[PDB]
Each structure stands twice: as structure tokens, then as C-alpha cells.
């Protein structure tokens, strides 16, 4: 137990085992028209705003309320040719995001439709 962001320098495989320690600090903390009130309130709205933006994607991919979901889109190696032991036992999430940064918007696309069509297939299957 290293704490919030404690494994930020640890390997992707290691940090992936302490995901709740970052998940619970995503909308809690300590956050009249005075300058401190105008300040403290928009800090309250900004936290809930960004939290629901991430949860919306997590829902539109079919991963609502789970910290690790497997998907159906395959890994286009042009995103990252690196190997599994080269990733999870070598790189940290910070440098990984720096490498895969451009393709995230693309990956977020096929994740969106892979669920929207899977929702359509389970509805055909349940029609029997």
C-alpha cells in the first residue's frame, strides 16, 4: 500500500493491482459569495464534471462499474509493436500514455461501436 498515485513510477502490471486507491480519490477530498466561495464552488462542479465524463465513456464501452474490463477490439500493432512482458513488466503507465497518446482517440472509437453492436447482437439472441 503506497497510497494515492503511490505506484506512479511502478510498472504497469504493478500499478494495475492498486486501482481502487486512485478510483476512490476521484471525487472526494475537502472540496456565501466571497472570493473563497466562488472559488470553492467551481472546484466542486469541476470534480463532478470530469468524473462523469470518464464514467460516460466507461459506460459507452460496456464497462460500467469495473476497474478492469476486457474488450473485443483487437490490438492494431501500429499503435504499439511492443510485447507484453516489454509492457507490463517494464514500462510505467506515465510513459505508456506518452507513447500511445495519438491512438487513444482512435481506440476510443472502435470501443464505442464494438459495444453498440454487441448490445444489438444480445438483443437478437434474446429474441428466441
Amino acid at each position: 500500500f503506497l497510497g494515492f498515485l503511490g505506484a506512479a513510477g511502478s510498472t504497469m502490471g504493478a500499478a494495475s493491482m492498486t486501482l481502487t486507491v486512485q478510483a476512490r480519490n476521484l471525487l472526494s477530498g475537502i472540496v456565501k459569495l466571497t472570493v473563497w466561495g466562488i472559488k470553492q464552488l467551481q472546484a466542486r462542479v469541476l470534480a463532478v464534471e470530469r468524473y462523469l465524463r470518464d464514467q460516460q465513456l466507461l459506460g459507452i464501452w460496456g464497462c460500467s462499474g469495473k476497474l478492469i474490463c476486457c474488450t473485443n477490439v483487437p490490438w492494431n500493432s501500429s499503435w504499439s509493436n511492443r510485447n507484453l512482458s516489454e509492457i507490463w513488466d517494464n514500462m510505467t503507465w506515465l510513459q505508456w500514455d506518452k507513447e500511445i497518446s495519438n491512438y487513444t482517440q482512435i481506440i476510443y472509437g472502435l470501443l464505442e461501436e464494438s459495444q453498440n453492436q454487441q448490445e444489438k447482437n444480445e438483443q437478437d439472441l434474446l429474441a428466441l
Partner: protein, 105 residues
């Protein structure tokens, strides 16, 4: 104590198979085998680690296999630069690399 092939060779297009074996102190099932391409007196190169996993960038022609008594290193479709000496490693997580004798191809 970890003996490999005396020597072998082929021709451009075919394959070769270097062996690697020893007693129950150096090999095998309880230890991981790694293979190194090593030109004499110069910078070596990792080609295979823990018995078949190849280092990044290694061409898919190189292949590793490990029987219960001896590890193998297949080098299919040979090409000129493969004229080299090859050594095998024997190692666990918390120890060192027990290198092999040698094999020139």
C-alpha cells in the same frame, strides 16, 4: 558444465539447431535458458530469454525450444551475418547466468 553443440553449419535457406544440456545443477526444467549471439571479442546480442521468448527486434527466424533435458535454438532461413558463436545461459530469477561452452555456425 553446461555443454552445447560442438559445431554445426548449413547454407542460405535451410536451418540449424544448436543444443544445450547439462546435469541437474545447470539444467533444465527448474531453470530458464537464454541464448546469446556473440561475435568474438565484440558486443553480444540477446536473442532468446526464458526458453523461447525472443528479445525485441529479433527476427522471427530464430526459435527456442526446451525439452526436459536439453534446450534447443533453431535458426531457420540462414543469412550471411549469422556466421557467429552462440552461447546459452542457465539462470533463475535470483541468481546469475551460467553460460555454456560455445557453438560456431
Amino acid at each position: 558444465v553446461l555443454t552445447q553443440s560442438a559445431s554445426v553449419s548449413g547454407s542460405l535457406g535451410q536451418s540449424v539447431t544448436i543444443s544445450c544440456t547439462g546435469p541437474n545443477s545447470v539444467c533444465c526444467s527448474h531453470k530458464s535458458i537464454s541464448w546469446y549471439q556473440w561475435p568474438p571479442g565484440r558486443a553480444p546480442t540477446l536473442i532468446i530469454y526464458e526458453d523461447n521468448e525472443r528479445a525485441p527486434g529479433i527476427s522471427p527466424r530464430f526459435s527456442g525450444y526446451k525439452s526436459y533435458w536439453s534446450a534447443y535454438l533453431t535458426i531457420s532461413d540462414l543469412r550471411p551475418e549469422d556466421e557467429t558463436t552462440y552461447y546459452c545461459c542457465s539462470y533463475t530469477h535470483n541468481s546469475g547466468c551460467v553460460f555454456g561452452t560455445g557453438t560456431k555456425v
